[PDB]
Design a protein around this ligand. Structure first.
Ligand SMILES: Nc1nc2c(ncn2[C@@H]2O[C@H](COP(=O)(O)OP(=O)(O)OP(=O)(O)O)[C@@H](O)[C@H]2O)c(=O)[nH]1
Ligand SMILES: Nc1ncnc2c1ncn2[C@@H]1O[C@H](COP(=O)(O)OP(=O)(O)CP(=O)(O)O)[C@@H](O)[C@H]1O
Ligand SMILES: Nc1nc2c(ncn2[C@@H]2O[C@H](COP(=O)(O)OP(=O)(O)O)[C@@H](O)[C@H]2O)c(=O)[nH]1
Ligand SMILES: CN1CCN(C(=O)Nc2ccc(F)cc2)CC1
Ligand SMILES: CN1CCN(C(=O)Nc2ccc(F)cc2)CC1
Ligand SMILES: [Ca+2]
Ligand SMILES: [Ca+2]
Ligand SMILES: [Ca+2]
Ligand SMILES: [Mg+2]
Ligand SMILES: [Mg+2]
Ligand SMILES: [Mg+2]
Lengths: 348, 423, 438, 54
């Protein structure tokens, strides 16, 4: 009989994993402040890693990787990519980005301004996007991007706004791709075969970045400020089977060749890069973590990495399967119970 | 050189106290005449904790035998190891206490306590560094209950900084047919709550159910009850009698998180009557030891929560497998251990096993489930006291009713106190 | 030459002391009767080993140590053990009843009645010192004597020897080898009143030593002898610079200078390797690189914690055996490219290296095998604050209910000393996070 | 990767390698604490003996 505690009541993902574990008659749940636990579904902020692995005779496992924030922060991801020879500042799948600190406070202001004037001088598209982990701005004037950040009191990352995104038809609309990646204690990188496209039900308009509804494919901005919500697909969410058939009928290609290869490459490269820093191979406690990768696809069928979410939620239609997979490879693999896997192992 | 002075008072105190000295004397290689005839140096290393060394290499228990009637003590002196006790240390009266706490505490007992204290003082004066005292007695009679607690209150006045530890037999309507028992037990519990540091609750109710249900003894006798008390007393004192890691005050510092909550539930495995052939495995010792049927307080631990636990395994056994099994009981029932006292379960191993057992286990629990014991006594007490039935036996010796009301309130508060830490 | 006096307090402090001085005599070739045939300066001398041994006209080499225990059983062993002749009776002090795992009982009650005596025995050793450096105090956090009397001694020593450094070797409590429930209380009480008086303290978590014995020595149920033999090796590596010719960490002052940039952050992490079982058929000897890399595996640290998520303020490699500077730098360069070693900005990114050619000495009949080269890394990492987090957490769980508090109030301590000590630990954890986090 | 302050001798050697540059109570006060705690124990034991006297 194994035990586990729950320290993030807001996790829709691990609420199901907790509901599934108990449904096995072999997992007992304890109060959140109870130390004799096998598994910890920890909180997001300030998870007490320093207290894990010090209960004699208890093999303890947690659903977060200590140090994974270096990958799931707007400013951290930029710093990690440039300062890491594995990825190198020349990384060709990450949009050119800069870490900008408001003037009320290293900083890449003067460096960001250099490349900006270079484009304006070279008649090239100079439409950037300013955002932060904590309010997004899309503008082709640099003075607007910096003044917006100064009006805030936190760090902001300004990256090149993909001005030529792949537009689905019909609708002439933008979209992004969320891939759910699971890393077990042994550091095997499993990719959930099912992904989703969070499409904009509004036609992309390259002459009006003020109307951030056809540009920001967020499910909250589409269901709120977008008036075509749910017109083409349900909940502005298109799954791989449909997106794959579209590429076959329209572009005469497939999702595996044209997009998925690059995606599986970006995932491997990122997690392999930070592996020496976060691996729990020789640690007194074990870690796993579900990741949410967000990609953009341009007209040329080139994949770009937008961000990496550390506490990602799942699409309604895929909660059951994926959450079960988390128990098969991430939990039961460490505490076995008395396919055709749904994941794709990215060997390395 | 951490000596302990042993006191046994009353019929039950001496009959059980006598068995105790009989049992451990066999473990330390001391014969009925006090001569040592063992084969292990480990028998004598801590021998001076309970024994004194005399000329000719004689070992004399550090025990004071007290009763208000000569009946029981003549039994001890004529018992197996009767010739081992110090002759002077026999202090007895001629009137008895007639199962009357008042007679033991205020009248018949006061007439005799000063002489009992002259022997206590004599035994303590010969100790290099006295740990404290231990008392065996019942709470339902008159001498052990009434005069026993009087001795505690006077010892504590003379040795305020020494530790007081008692083995106290709680009365049960299944063993005793004396109506006043709840009165004597309630009055005694009031004293123990205030004046002892550690009290092992030996419930005759539990002892009876073990002999009748588990052991299958159809007509249990005190010899059957006291066989379980022997094994337990030997078990709980193992840490003190053999080189282990041990000190009365140290036990108290780790068992007693709150001064009033110093009443322990003892346990023992394997439960045996006076045909053990098959070896008991370590997992078998652990399950029985924690199962309620092996508890000697008549309290279902599943009804309360453990504040602290201490386990002692004796014999040559896998010390590694002991940790596994112990940590398995905690991590499989951690809902019965308070979570605000880290690592409240401790275990030791001793290599010398009791007589006739390849290996045994003793359980010492400070559980809030002990409240069921005090509730039981309190229900019986109030059933009579609301009618003031049988009070004339007591008011005739000078007691007032208010003194009963106070003892009633002290014990019901104790139950309320146990109930708060259980939540 | 400048003498160092060791003070062993409580059971753990004395039994560990008995293990160190055993090893000190083997490493310096001193016999159990105090004879040292190698010292040609009979009757004295100002050599490196004299910093730890005094000499008599009869040629006996006497440790500069004082053993203090509030109960006689543990020190009586040293009075009749193999090295019974090394120490004279004045050096061994024992009471009659111990502190009962009660910090207050050790600090206030029993400590008051024996404090002025221990200080008088110490003065008798200092009078034999032409130039005393300071003291190395061995004790446990958990025991009533190790925590309670130690803090009292540290306050007194600071008064009677103001300009003298005081290093600690402190045993951090681990449930796997402890039967006391109130050790978190004692650990925090002593760290509060001792912190301002200690210039550098090397914590050893018994949980760490326990697993090293089960994992590397194949000991199913490790005994205190198994633990103390390993602990003394680490202590010997850390004290070698004071007992042997050399230039790194030549005196106690050089420890605080090289390891402690901030006075409160004076708890360096220790990592030792290789730990090889003598029962092995025969081990393939490890290279300078292999053992240097091992100093960054958590399984070889005296405290389990992840230095990858702290920042370093100082790093010191102490090698014993066949080791030349060329290979050290080779191993270092390899480890920087592969390991996450983050120093604080206001500090340099570098390592101090010390090489002593004599390989580690093994105790006959012990569990450790003879190795051609070993290393002990001393790193001041903010990651060691994880130990304070665990300790403080257990304290909070019990103190919220005031469990066991009455045992301390009963010995004369005020309840405010609990919360006072706890607030200090809160400030210590905050100081660590200020340095190592962004 | 620079070595500095190489010191050699018969029994060993030591050096320093830099990879990158950077960027009490009195005797009287203790006697009062000890005696204050002793007085509180005296007061506590006095109230206990008073209890026993009654
Ligand atoms: N490593 C190691 N730890 C020890 C040793 N002896 C005791 N300990 C640890 O020390 C803690 C108990 O403190 P002690 O040193 O035994 O107590 P004390 O200093 O003698 O003080 P008292 O309370 O009077 O007994 C426990 O956590 C033990 O694990 C030892 O020899 N080696
Ligand atoms: N460089 C870029 N070029 C084009 N569009 C971009 C972009 N960066 C962000 N976007 C738009 O913004 C959305 C992603 O925003 P971002 O992920 O930074 O905010 P967020 O973190 O609150 C959403 P999530 O819930 O996925 O974490 C995408 O739908 C995309 O259309
Ligand atoms: N377990 C056990 N209980 C006993 C024994 N003798 C008496 N009792 C119990 O103790 C109570 C009677 O007290 P008793 O010792 O005879 O009174 P006293 O002689 O006046 O002190 C009853 O509840 C009995 O059941 C005994 O030998 N063993
Ligand atoms: C040894 N004693 C015998 C008496 N006793 C008991 O049975 N009390 C009781 C009182 C009133 C009532 F109604 C029922 C029971 C406690 C144990
Ligand atoms: C005078 N009465 C006779 C009945 N009686 C008895 O049978 N005691 C008993 C002892 C042990 C046991 F287990 C059960 C009962 C109590 C005394
Ligand atoms: Ca009379
Ligand atoms: Ca000499
Ligand atoms: Ca100082
Ligand atoms: Mg986000
Ligand atoms: Mg009778
Ligand atoms: Mg001790």
């Amino acid at each position: 009989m194994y035990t586990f505690v729950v320290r993030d009541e807001n996790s829709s993902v691990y609420a199901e994993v907790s509901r599934l574990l108990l449904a096995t008659g072999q997992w007992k749940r304890l109060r959140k402040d109870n130390p004799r636990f096998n598994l910890m579904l920890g909180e997001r902020n300030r998870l007490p890693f320093g207290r894990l692995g010090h209960e004699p005779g208890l093999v303890q496992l947690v659903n977060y990787y200590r140090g994974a924030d270096k990958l799931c922060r707007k400013a951290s991801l930029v710093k990690l990519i440039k300062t890491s020879p594995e990825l190198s500042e020349s990384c060709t799948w990450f949009p050119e980005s800069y870490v900008i600190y408001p003037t009320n406070l290293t900083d890449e202001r003067e460096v960001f301004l250099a490349a900006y004037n270079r484009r304006r001088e070279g008649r090239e598209g100079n439409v950037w996007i300013a955002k932060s982990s904590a309010g997004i701005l899309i503008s082709s004037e640099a003075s607007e991007l910096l003044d917006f950040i100064d009006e805030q009191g936190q760090v902001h990352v300004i990256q090149k706004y993909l001005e030529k995104p792949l537009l689905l038809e019909p609708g002439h609309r933008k979209f992004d791709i969320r891939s759910w990646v699971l890393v077990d204690h042994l550091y095997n990188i499993y990719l959930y075969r099912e992904g989703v496209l969070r499409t904009s039900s509004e036609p992309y308009n390259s002459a009006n970045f003020q109307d951030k509804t056809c540009h920001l494919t967020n499910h909250c901005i589409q269901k709120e400020y977008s008036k075509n919500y749910g017109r083409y697909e349900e909940g502005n969410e298109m799954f791989f089977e449909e997106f794959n058939q579209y590429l076959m009928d329209a572009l005469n290609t497939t999702l595996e060749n044209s997009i998925l290869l690059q995606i599986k490459h970006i995932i491997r490269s990122c997690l392999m890069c930070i592996e020496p820093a976060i691996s729990t191979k020789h640690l007194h406690y074990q870690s796993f973590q579900l990741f949410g990768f967000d990609f953009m696809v341009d007209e040329e069928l080139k994949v770009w990495l937008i961000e990496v979410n550390g506490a990602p939620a799942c699409a309604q239609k895929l909660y059951a399967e994926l959450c079960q997979g988390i128990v098969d490879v991430a939990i039961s693999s460490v505490f076995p119970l008395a396919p055709t896997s749904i994941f794709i192992k990215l060997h390395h | 050189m951490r000596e302990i002075v042993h006191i046994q008072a009353g019929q039950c105190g001496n009959q059980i106290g006598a068995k105790f000295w009989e049992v451990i004397s066999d473990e330390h290689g001391i014969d009925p005449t006090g001569s040592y005839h063992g084969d292990s140096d480990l028998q004598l290393e801590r021998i001076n904790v309970y024994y004194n060394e005399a000329t000719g290499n004689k070992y004399v228990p550090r025990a004071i035998l007290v009763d208000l009637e000569p009946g029981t003590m003549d039994s001890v002196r004529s018992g197996p190891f009767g010739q081992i006790f110090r002759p002077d240390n026999f202090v007895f009266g001629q009137s008895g206490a007639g199962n009357n706490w008042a007679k033991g505490h205020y009248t018949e007992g006061a007439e005799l306590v000063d002489s009992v204290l002259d022997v206590v003082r004599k035994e303590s004066e010969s100790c290099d560094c006295l740990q404290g005292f231990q008392l065996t007695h019942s709470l339902g009679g008159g001498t052990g209950s009434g005069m026993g607690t009087l001795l505690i209150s006077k010892i504590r006045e003379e040795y305020p900084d020494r530790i007081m530890n008692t083995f106290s037999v709680m009365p049960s309507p299944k063993v005793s047919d004396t109506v006043v028992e709840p009165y004597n037990a309630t009055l005694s519990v009031h004293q123990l709550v205030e004046n002892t540091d550690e009290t092992y609750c030996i419930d005759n109710e539990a002892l009876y159910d073990i002999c009748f249900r588990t052991l299958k003894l159809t007509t249990p006798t005190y010899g059957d009850l006291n066989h379980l008390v022997s094994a337990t007393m030997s078990g709980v004192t193992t840490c003190l009698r053999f080189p282990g890691q041990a000190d009365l005050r140290k036990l108290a510092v780790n068992m007693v998180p709150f001064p009033r909550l110093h009443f322990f539930m003892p346990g023992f495995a394997p439960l045996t009557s006076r045909q053990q052939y098959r070896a008991l495995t370590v997992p078998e010792l652990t399950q029985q030891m924690f199962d309620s049927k092996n508890m000697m307080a008549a309290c279902d631990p599943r009804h309360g929560r453990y504040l602290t636990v201490a386990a002692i395994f004796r014999g040559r056994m896998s010390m590694k497998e002991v940790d596994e099994q112990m940590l398995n009981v905690q991590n499989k029932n951690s809902s019965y251990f308070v979570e605000w006292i880290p690592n409240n379960v401790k275990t030791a191993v001793c290599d010398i096993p009791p007589r006739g057992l390849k290996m045994s286990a003793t359980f010492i629990g400070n559980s809030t489930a002990i409240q069921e014991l005090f509730k039981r006594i309190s229900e019986q007490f109030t059933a009579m006291f609301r009618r003031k039935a049988f009070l004339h036996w007591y008011t005739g010796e000078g007691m007032d009713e208010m003194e009963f009301t106070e003892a009633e309130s002290n014990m019901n508060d104790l139950v309320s106190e146990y109930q708060q830490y259980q939540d | 030459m400048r003498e160092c006096i060791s003070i062993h307090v409580g059971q753990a402090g004395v039994q560990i002391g008995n293990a160190c001085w055993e090893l000190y005599c083997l490493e310096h070739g001193i016999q159990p009767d105090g004879q040292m045939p190698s010292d040609k300066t009979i009757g004295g001398g100002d050599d490196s080993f004299n910093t730890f041994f005094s000499e008599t006209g009869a040629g006996k080499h006497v440790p500069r140590a004082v053993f203090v225990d509030l109960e006689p059983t543990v020190i009586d062993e040293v009075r009749t053990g193999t090295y019974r002749q090394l120490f004279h009776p004045e050096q061994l002090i024992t009471g009659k009843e111990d502190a009962a795992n009660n910090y207050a009982r050790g600090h206030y009650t029993i400590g008051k009645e024996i404090i002025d005596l221990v200080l008088d025995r110490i003065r008798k050793l200092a009078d034999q010192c032409t130039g005393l450096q300071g003291f190395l105090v061995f004790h446990s956090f958990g025991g009533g004597t190790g925590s309670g009397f130690t803090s009292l001694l540290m306050e007194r020593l600071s008064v009677d020897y103001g300009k003298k450094s005081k290093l600690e070797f402190s045993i951090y409590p681990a449930p796997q080898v402890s039967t006391a429930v109130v050790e978190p209380y004692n650990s925090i009480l002593t760290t509060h009143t001792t912190l301002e008086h200690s210039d550098c303290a090397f914590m050893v978590d018994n949980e760490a030593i326990y697993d090293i014995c089960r994992r590397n020595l194949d000991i199913e149920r490790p005994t205190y002898t198994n633990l103390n033999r390993l602990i003394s090796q680490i202590v010997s590596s850390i004290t070698a610079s004071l007992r042997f010719d050399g230039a790194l960490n030549v005196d106690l002052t050089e420890f605080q200078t090289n390891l402690v940039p901030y006075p409160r952050i004076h708890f360096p992490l220790a990592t030792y390797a290789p730990v090889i079982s003598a029962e092995k058929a025969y081990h393939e000897q490890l290279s300078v690189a292999e053992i240097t890399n091992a100093c960054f595996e958590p399984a070889n640290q005296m405290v389990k914690c992840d230095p990858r998520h702290g920042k370093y303020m100082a790093c010191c490699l102490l090698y014993r055996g066949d080791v030349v500077p060329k290979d050290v730098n080779a191993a270092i360069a390899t480890i920087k490219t592969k390991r996450s070693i983050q120093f604080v900005d206001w500090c340099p990114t570098g390592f101090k290296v010390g090489i002593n050619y004599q390989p580690p000495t093994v105790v006959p009949g012990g569990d450790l095998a003879k190795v051609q080269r070993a290393v002990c890394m001393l790193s001041n990492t903010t990651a060691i604050a994880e130990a304070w987090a665990r300790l403080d957490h257990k304290f909070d769980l019990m103190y919220a209910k005031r469990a066991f508090v009455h045992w301390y109030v009963g010995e004369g301590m005020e309840e405010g000393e609990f919360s006072e000590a706890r607030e200090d630990m809160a400030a210590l954890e905050k100081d660590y996070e200020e340095v190592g986090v962004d | 990767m620079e070595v500095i302050e190489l010191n050699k001798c018969t029994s060993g050697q030591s050096f320093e390698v830099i990879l990158k540059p950077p960027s009490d109570p009195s005797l009287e006060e203790i006697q009062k604490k000890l005696e204050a705690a002793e007085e509180r124990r005296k007061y506590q034991e006095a109230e206990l003996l008073k209890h026993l006297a009654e």
